[PDB]
Symmetry: C3
Subunit: 188 residues, 3 copies
């Protein structure tokens, strides 16, 4: 297997020295840099850059600068996704975002695990754990979501939360660590 | 009532589709972009931009870039307010800051509430809850303050705090959620 | 003693009005501004700027922009230090970082203490508490480290942690406040 293949298979992979991955990270970083230095009212140029970054034709994905991502093509986005300032989609592990998702400022979605043993870590190995963000969700600012975590559809995550475990659908959840407070009635 | 009027009255308002509000948000974003790309030693240009953003003549308001705000004119500032890097004043609900206030880096002051029910939220409605920051206050870095919260004069908020409830005057408070530790003797 | 000398001696010093310190802060800020607006693929220019900022010849210190520091020359770095996006090394008190250190995004290392009494604080006095980051360490994103804190070699700090007290070597630690979970076996 190539290191990309290992990355996408939740296997340990040589994140630091593999050339294809190094190149892809460089591509995304330079696109982010361009985006981050594009005037917010330059609507068409921003759309172009975002679509280039995510390698897709987005539908009402609004990104408030600055923004960061590692690969870009490993963020799968629904329509009507509102990303406020200074978010980071660390997407070695796929980050899947549904439709109608409100992401507050300074949110970090982290899919990278490093080894606990520093000898292995120092060699550059990582393991990627995908993040699944359901449709119809709202994240407050300053939220961090950890590798492998799923946040169910219709759920609301309070500001400051550190989401270390899966959050069921239609739930209000807050805290560090993030814990369900109660259910949300999402009926029409 | 116009949507601005509803915003300022703590009523639900159509934050996403109202044209006056969309225009005002665009004005502030482009000013922030300019500010954020102005060399820190360009003292007069920065002062000009800050005063334009807040629509006021500031008195020793020091803003370390980057900085973000939604409207700018809905941040009311005292004199001698020191804002470190990467703060966000989300000011749909008025943010009132007193005199002699030290704001650490990566602090977010959030006045926006969205509906819990995703059907209402998805339609773009918000409700703004003003934030009142007393004079003679100090915030550590990485603090988030939630809608409707008042932090009393003379109080100190530890790094990392998530301030979900009002903090009385002359109090030392820390945590997520932020809780008073003890009183501060602020006598001369 | 000069105010720099007091700063470096853990004494109260006039951080706000001393001219040498004001000048040094201005030097570092303008270097950071340049760095933060340099294309990430401009490898040689970035290396130049980083070495200028830290006043040293770095060895595989990788800084993902944006980055911020107060003095730069008061950050002592080992080799193979990986700093992800939007970190702040607030280095009035010396920040010493070992070899083989992985620093996640949105981490803040804060060495400044202000007086609790607002009358003293308002006069601009600060006290700097050095931070020591051991070799062979890994910090998740959104971590804040407070003044005077030491994180032992071989230790791992979970995302979102607020490190208010020293963390022993070879420890896994998480939380706000950050607490040791268990020991790490770091044997070959």
């Amino acid at each position: 297997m190539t290191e990309k293949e290992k990355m996408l298979a939740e296997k340990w992979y040589d994140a630091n020295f593999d050339q294809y991955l190094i190149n892809e990270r460089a591509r995304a970083k330079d696109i982010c840099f361009e985006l981050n230095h594009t005037r917010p009212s330059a609507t068409n140029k921003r759309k172009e850059l975002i679509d280039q970054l995510f390698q897709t034709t987005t539908d009402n994905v609004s990104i408030s600068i600055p923004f960061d991502t590692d690969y870009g093509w490993n963020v799968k986005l629904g329509k009507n996704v509102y990303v406020n300032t200074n978010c980071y989609f660390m997407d070695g592990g796929q980050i899947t975002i549904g439709d109608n998702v409100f992401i507050g400022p300074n949110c970090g979605f982290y899919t990278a695990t490093h080894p606990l043993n520093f000898h292995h870590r120092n060699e550059g190995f990582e393991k990627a754990g995908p993040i699944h963000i359901g449709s119809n969700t709202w994240f407050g600012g300053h939220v961090a979501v950890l590798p492998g975590v799923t946040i169910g559809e219709g759920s609301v995550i309070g500001a400051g939360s550190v989401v270390t475990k899966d959050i069921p659908p239609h739930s209000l959840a807050v805290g560090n660590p993030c814990k369900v407070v109660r259910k949300i009635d999402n009926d029409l």
